[PDB]
Amino acid sequence: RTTRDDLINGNSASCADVIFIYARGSTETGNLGTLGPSIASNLESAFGKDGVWIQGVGGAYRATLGDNALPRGTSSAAIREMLGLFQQANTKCPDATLIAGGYSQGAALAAASIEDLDSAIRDKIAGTVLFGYTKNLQNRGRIPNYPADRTKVFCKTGDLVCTGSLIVAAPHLAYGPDARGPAPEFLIEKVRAVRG
Fold this sequence. Notes:
The chain contains six helices and five strands; from the N terminus they run βαβαβααββαα. It has helices at 36-47, 76-92, 105-116, 119-123, 176-180, 182-195, and strands at residues 18-23, 52-56, 97-103, 125-131, 151-154. The PDB classes it as hydrolase.
């Protein structure tokens, strides 16, 4: 369940209405890690199995710990990868509503990729949930070039990565309940507002 390739294995002849691209934290298994699956199970509950594609950022995204120390908090390979999946969503299913998310390094990944994204594709991302956002201070609680009103950052008090650190403290491991309730609920609200 920690590997999902709904978009990649998806085709333009049979598109989902919603596409969720998600980035995992450093060293997490699969393309979804610990938080991806709970988010994805809840979405499928809202829109139906056939109503939503779940797509982890795999491939060139190795989610290496040293990569947090790079300028934008992740590698360029990883950014090119995530951008490509956004692109692949846009072409494969141009009527799809997009949603996005990341944890730790993958929060850095999502934010870097969404900044870089063509404004036309970025406009289709209805919401983005970030957990233990490692560039939360550096980007002032926001994703550059993306609306605060489509962004939800979960950054617990005493999660040091939210205040410009790379030190992992216990509050950084406690996003479990957020990925099971608040996070997907925000995503679901945003999609339904956009789509009607």
